[PDB]
Design a protein around this ligand. Structure first.
Ligand SMILES: *[C@@H]1O[C@H](CO)[C@@H](O[C@@H]2O[C@H](CO)[C@@H](O)[C@H](O)[C@H]2NC(C)=O)[C@H](O)[C@H]1NC(C)=O
Ligand SMILES: *[C@H]1O[C@H](CO)[C@@H](O[C@@H]2O[C@H](CO)[C@@H](O)[C@H](O)[C@H]2NC(C)=O)[C@H](O)[C@H]1NC(C)=O
Ligand SMILES: *[C@@H]1O[C@H](CO)[C@@H](O)[C@H](O)[C@H]1NC(C)=O
Ligand SMILES: *[C@@H]1O[C@H](CO)[C@@H](O)[C@H](O)[C@H]1NC(C)=O
Ligand SMILES: *[C@@H]1O[C@H](CO)[C@@H](O)[C@H](O)[C@H]1NC(C)=O
Ligand SMILES: *[C@@H]1O[C@H](CO)[C@@H](O)[C@H](O)[C@H]1NC(C)=O
Ligand SMILES: *[C@@H]1O[C@H](CO)[C@@H](O)[C@H](O)[C@H]1NC(C)=O
Lengths: 344, 726, 49, 49
């Protein structure tokens, strides 16, 4: 679904791949209905085994996918409603709903299973649905988030990144401009930025021992979390600003560099969230009608240059040198269509 | 600890008011509760609040409007805010755009050509107070799937309306219908036949066992044909008593009828005919099925024969000597004697006196004898200090159908009293069970139930006295409430205490009473109840008439009593077609079973439950003593469960639910006037009861089924009796 | 022959519990691993059911 | 499908019964795809044989 949206938003698509993907989507949808619970919950096996209860994160993952799938193809609201009320039912008074661990693999999920991170992924998956912040469930969710954020902020460690990033993204979905400002500032403090981009990572050397093959029982989940960081940068109530877009550009450069030649990315979660992030980026940046951009560079030593950008040369890298020692290079852009301007 | 408890039926009838209760006690009185019933998807919010104090129960009746969908779920949250305390709890509530309960009533059941049908329609809400409302559609339908008449978009103002429609001279014959359609898409029906016929002037009636069994050599039978003014009729009688389903093929011209025995009689001038028959020709055995009796009186000087089908279902049952329960506690407890009262009957339904029996209480090892008294009753008592779940049985004979049970070609059995009971969870080791009057409950009267409260240690620290709180639930909602506090003995177990309560009305044919006592340590006990409330109404009503008279004796009266400002629907009908064919389910029982959701018992389906988190599962179960041993789930009754089968849901903090651990993580001079009707009208009841003047129809002699159906906004509806005017 | 089987293992508390055998070291087992045998009256062997 | 058309042609319908029928249709469609042939033909059992 997320690659469907990537294709349709970048416009590199066709009705054939479209129809084949649509068939895939209906097929996977129904084969997934064949695993859920009578209450509406969802399990790995589920049906044909009466003694069972579903998992939370899995129900949330299927909910998010049902959301965007509704966004593209048809799907019924009753299933998402039932899974939603199920998510509510598990919630505590002020604590957030528990983890009814009924999975088979920790690779499918990129998080650490913590109630904090779990509830964060859940409530953000909620907020991707058009959901009022005034809702009870979300009200309690934000309460959890604020609490957990303060505990991890004032604390010298709350994993420092993944928790904090997911919290940031959910806080952005709320409306708490100040809160998202402070948290993104904090994540920006602990930076893994590089020669021409930015990203984030887990501690890189866990304090306690680890396994052998690729750090087993630890996917290390850098792409998905960086993608969520990006996603958090991309969302304001009227439209984002410039500086969030620059940060987004850098982290997206890292993202696209971190893509696997086999296709997708190192897993399914990170692939999904990364494609969601890039889709939202292009929805912001990649305008399909803005096609008349004109750039004009002017420098105090009468060093003037001019460039044009349109659809035909959309992917063009127009490069030009800059000889003057004291650089006072005034860029001036006009027209339509976003432009990235990388100087070194 | 400071304590609260808020309670409400899990269902919500919308577009009206619904009651819910709250209890509060033990400190920081200045508290504010608030219920928020919210439509999750999209958004809706209905907000309700109250400010309250300690040691008080109070119930608020919040109202709900209509919605978009017919039936929905809603998040009900509740917030308790005391000056130094806060609590919040939510769940799912079933909301439903209830369909008003409505119906019809005709002038007559059957119709002949040239006449006009006349009927009326009625509607009501949960409370049987009348309801004025616009109806989308009602219509009359002709048997071919085609329509004959229709009326649309009409408003009830007295909670009812009347309509008529004339039939042609040569329409279609058969079962015509009338149908209503409501704004919800709900539809209702009331049939009526249409055909030619003659007016009867007598009715045969048999007397015979309504229930006949195996061990029967003979049978009393009698034939009595009532007449005009119930007078005796002379002529001829012939009955055809019959068994059915012989070895015939029920096909290839083979009559399925088994032995049909025919008895004639000359129906005498005075009195009625009798006959004693012998059942040897019937072979009251395995493969000779139920008993139909078709009695045909040919009245003389007309040649006119009419039949009655009778006692078709005379239960020739295998289960002979069937004893019974009456008042069985469904439950027992580890610290108590329970005493079941148990009647004994057999066959026809007559109790046997002085008959020994054996009573086996298993997992109490209580093998005790008793006997049947004049009423077949035994009140066996069993002390209970024992294991989890108890089984109980009683017999008069042994655990087998002693005479020739194994042949595959046998027809006999004997009932066995069977019953099972589970105990409460009471970690306090205190509990309150109730001795009820568990049988038929009259109306308009007070009754005292009694209660066996017991207190492990009493209040541990607490204060001196304690409190009990009882609720009487009706029609899936709430009706009545109260409480009672009592000074506790210092550290002791006090057993008995009674409670009286009124049975005026305003309560379902079931009355779900419960009670619960509360302990400042955060603890609680209680117990439910059930009373088969006799079908009985709030607004009393009555009828009468100036008495019977002669043939054209025009001036007659009808009178009715009801509430001082009301109306009544008055159906006097010449009882000949009604003699020919009866009415249809017209009674208070009609009103009652027409109700939607008689009993709220258990939550609905779409909502499952609300789970909690406490898992006491040890790594190893830590079973000190002689040996170790694993974990397992119990099976026993709970307060959460008491309030579930009660029907409602509640929020609190105390230990209500049992600490069910989490499952295992391990995985892989006269001029005739119209007959067939006398009076069909509406009338108003002043503040002194009404009295109208009916007008004696000539040239007609039968019963006069008078029917009174009254209505007032204040007292609700009323159903008065079958007064004749012979 | 000292079979200690209740009808059920008789827990009052969170729930009831089932039966199971144990696994721990014993004086009888001490003397078996010793390689010898003996006769007494006291409770040496665990009260197996 | 034909009763869907009947409801939508006579106009005695609603989006609820519509959505439920739509779910039925997708479900039956896919369960039928699970019986067809690789050439495109269709059999009662078909696949897994
Ligand atoms: C394809 O991607 C576009 C990117 O804008 C999505 O947005 C739609 O663009 C089309 C262009 O014709 C507009 O007509 C729609 O109003 C836009 N909004 C929609 C339809 O969601 C669009 O979702 C995708 N599909 C298309 C091309 O409509
Ligand atoms: C069923 O009912 C309609 C009745 O007209 C069917 O016909 C369609 O009606 C729509 C109305 O806008 C036309 O635009 C279509 O051209 C008609 N043919 C279609 C849509 O197949 C239609 O088959 C069904 N659905 C509706 C109500 O359109
Ligand atoms: C839902 O939210 C809006 C927010 O302004 C509110 O005004 C509205 O009354 C709510 N209910 C409906 C049906 O829109
Ligand atoms: C209730 O009041 C007492 C005294 O003011 C206070 O100590 C307590 O914290 C309050 N809240 C409780 C018992 O929850
Ligand atoms: C009914 O049967 C009994 C014998 O069982 C007999 O004595 C009696 O006369 C019969 N008739 C009536 C009215 O009891
Ligand atoms: C049943 O017990 C009573 C004593 O309580 C005894 O009289 C009676 O004989 C016993 N039953 C039989 C069949 O003897
Ligand atoms: C009930 O029976 C048990 C048997 O031990 C006894 O302990 C208890 O005192 C009896 N209670 C009575 C007769 O009230």
């Amino acid at each position: 679904i997320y690659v469907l949206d990537y294709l349709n938003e970048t416009q590199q698509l066709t009705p054939e791949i479209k129809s084949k993907a649509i068939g895939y989507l209906n097929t996977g949808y129904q084969r997934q209905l064949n695993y859920k619970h009578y209450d509406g919950s969802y399990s790995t096996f589920g049906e044909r085994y009466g003694r069972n209860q579903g998992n939370t994160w899995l129900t949330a993952f299927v909910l998010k996918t049902f959301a965007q799938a509704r966004a593209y193809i048809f799907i019924d609201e009753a299933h998402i409603t039932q899974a939603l009320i199920w998510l509510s039912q598990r919630q505590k008074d002020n604590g957030c709903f528990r983890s009814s661990g009924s999975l088979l693999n920790n690779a499918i999920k990129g998080g650490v299973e913590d109630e904090v991170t779990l509830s964060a992924y859940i409530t953000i998956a909620l907020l991707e649905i058009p959901l009022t912040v005034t809702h009870p469930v979300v009200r309690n969710a934000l309460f959890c988030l604020e609490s957990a954020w303060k505990t991890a902020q004032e604390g010298d460690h709350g994993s420092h990144v993944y928790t904090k990033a997911l919290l940031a993204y959910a806080f952005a979905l709320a409306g708490n401009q100040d809160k998202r400002k402070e948290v993104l500032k904090s994540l920006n403090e602990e930076a893994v930025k590089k020669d021409n981009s930015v990203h984030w990572e887990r501690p890189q050397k866990p304090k306690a021992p680890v396994g052998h093959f690729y750090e087993p029982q630890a996917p290390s989940a850098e792409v998905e979390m960086t993608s969520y960081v990006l996603l958090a940068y991309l969302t304001a109530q009227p439209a984002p600003t410039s500086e969030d877009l620059t940060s987004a550009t850098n982290i997206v450069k890292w993202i696209t560099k971190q893509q696997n030649a086999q296709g997708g990315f190192s897993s399914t979660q990170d692939t999904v969230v990364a494609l969601h992030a890039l889709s939202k980026y292009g929805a912001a940046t990649f305008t399909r009608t803005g096609k008349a951009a004109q750039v004009t560079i002017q420098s105090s030593g009468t060093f003037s240059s001019k460039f044009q950008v349109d659809n035909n040369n959309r992917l063009l890298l127009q490069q030009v040198s800059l000889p003057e020692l004291p650089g006072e290079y005034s860029m001036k852009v006009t027209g339509e269509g976003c432009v990235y301007l990388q100087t070194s | 600890k400071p304590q609260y408890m808020v309670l409400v039926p899990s269902l919500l009838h919308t577009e009206t008011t619904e009651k819910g209760c709250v209890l509060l006690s033990y400190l920081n009185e200045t508290v504010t509760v608030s219920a928020s019933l919210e439509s999750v998807r999209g958004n809706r919010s209905l907000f309700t609040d109250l400010e309250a104090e300690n040691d008080v129960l109070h119930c608020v009746a919040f109202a709900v409007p209509k919605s978009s969908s017919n039936e929905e779920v809603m998040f009900l949250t509740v917030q308790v805010k005391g000056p130094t305390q806060e609590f919040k709890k939510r769940t799912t509530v079933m909301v439903k755009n209830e369909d008003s309960l409505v119906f019809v009533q005709t002038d007559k059941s059957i119709y002949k050509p040239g006449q006009t049908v006349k009927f009326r329609v009625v509607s009501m809400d949960e409370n049987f107070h009348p309801l004025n409302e616009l109806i989308p559609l009602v219509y009359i339908q002709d048997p071919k799937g085609n329509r004959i008449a229709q009326w649309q978009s009409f408003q009830l103002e007295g909670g009812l309306k009347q309509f008529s429609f004339p039939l042609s001279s040569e329409p279609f014959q058969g079962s015509y219908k009338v149908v209503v359609q409501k704004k919800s898409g709900g539809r209702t029906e009331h049939p009526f036949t249409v055909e030619e016929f003659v007016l009867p002037k007598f009715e045969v009636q048999v007397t015979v066992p309504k229930i006949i069994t195996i061990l029967e050599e003979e049978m009393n039978v009698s034939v009595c044909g009532l007449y005009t003014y119930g007078k005796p009729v002379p002529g001829h009688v012939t009955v055809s008593i019959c068994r059915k389903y012989s070895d015939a093929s029920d096909c290839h011209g083979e009559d399925s009828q088994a032995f049909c025995e025919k008895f004639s009689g000359q129906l005498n001038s005075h009195g009625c005919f009798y006959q004693q028959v012998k059942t040897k020709v019937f072979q009251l055995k395995r493969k000779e099925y139920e008993m139909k009796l078709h009695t045909e009186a040919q009245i003389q000087e007309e040649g006119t024969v009419v039949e009655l089908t009778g006692r078709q279902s005379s239960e020739i049952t295998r289960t002979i000597t069937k004893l019974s329960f009456v008042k069985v506690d469904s439950h027992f407890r580890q610290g108590i004697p329970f005493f079941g009262q148990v009647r004994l009957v057999d066959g026809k339904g007559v109790p046997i006196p002085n008959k020994v029996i054996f009573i086996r209480g298993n997992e109490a090892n209580y093998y005790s004898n008793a006997t049947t008294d004049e009423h077949g009753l035994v009140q066996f008592s069993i002390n209970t200090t024992n294991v989890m779940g108890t089984s109980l049985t009683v017999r008069v004979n042994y655990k087998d159908r002693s005479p020739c049970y194994g042949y595959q070609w046998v027809s006999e059995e004997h009932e066995e009293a069977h019953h099972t009971a589970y105990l409460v969870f009471s970690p306090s080791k205190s509990f309150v069970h109730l001795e009820p009057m568990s049988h038929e409950l009259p109306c308009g009267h007070t009754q005292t139930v009694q209660a066996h409260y017991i207190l492990n240690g009493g209040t541990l620290l607490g204060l001196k006295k304690l409190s009990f709180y009882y609720l009487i639930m009706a029609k899936g909602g709430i009706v009545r409430t109260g409480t009672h506090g009592l000074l506790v003995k210092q550290e002791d177990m006090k057993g008995h205490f009674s409670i009286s309560i009124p049975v005026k009305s305003d309560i379902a044919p079931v009355a779900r009473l419960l009670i619960y006592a509360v302990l400042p340590t955060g603890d609680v006990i209680g117990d439910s109840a059930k009373y088969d409330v006799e079908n009985c109404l709030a607004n009393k009503v009555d009828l009468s008439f100036s008495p019977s008279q002669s043939l054209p004796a025009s001036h007659a009266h009808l009178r009715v009593t009801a509430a001082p400002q009301s109306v009544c629907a008055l159906r006097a009908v010449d009882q000949s077609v009604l003699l020919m064919k009866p009415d249809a389910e017209l009674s208070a029982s009609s009103v009652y079973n027409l109700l939607p959701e008689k009993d709220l018992t258990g939550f609905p389906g779409p909502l499952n439950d609300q789970d909690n988190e406490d898992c006491i599962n040890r790594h190893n179960v830590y079973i000190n003593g002689i040996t170790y041993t694993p974990v397992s789930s119990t099976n026993e009754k709970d307060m959460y469960s008491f309030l579930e089968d009660m029907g409602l849901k509640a929020f609190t903090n105390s230990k209500i639910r049992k600490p069910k651990m989490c499952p295992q993580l391990q995985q892989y001079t006269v001029r005739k006037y119209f007959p067939e009707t006398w009076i069909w009208d509406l009338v108003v009841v002043n503040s002194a009861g009404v009295a109208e003047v009916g007008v004696t129809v000539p040239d007609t002699i039968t019963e006069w089924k008078a029917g009174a159906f009254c209505l007032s906004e204040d007292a609700g509806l009323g159903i008065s009796s079958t007064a004749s005017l012979r």
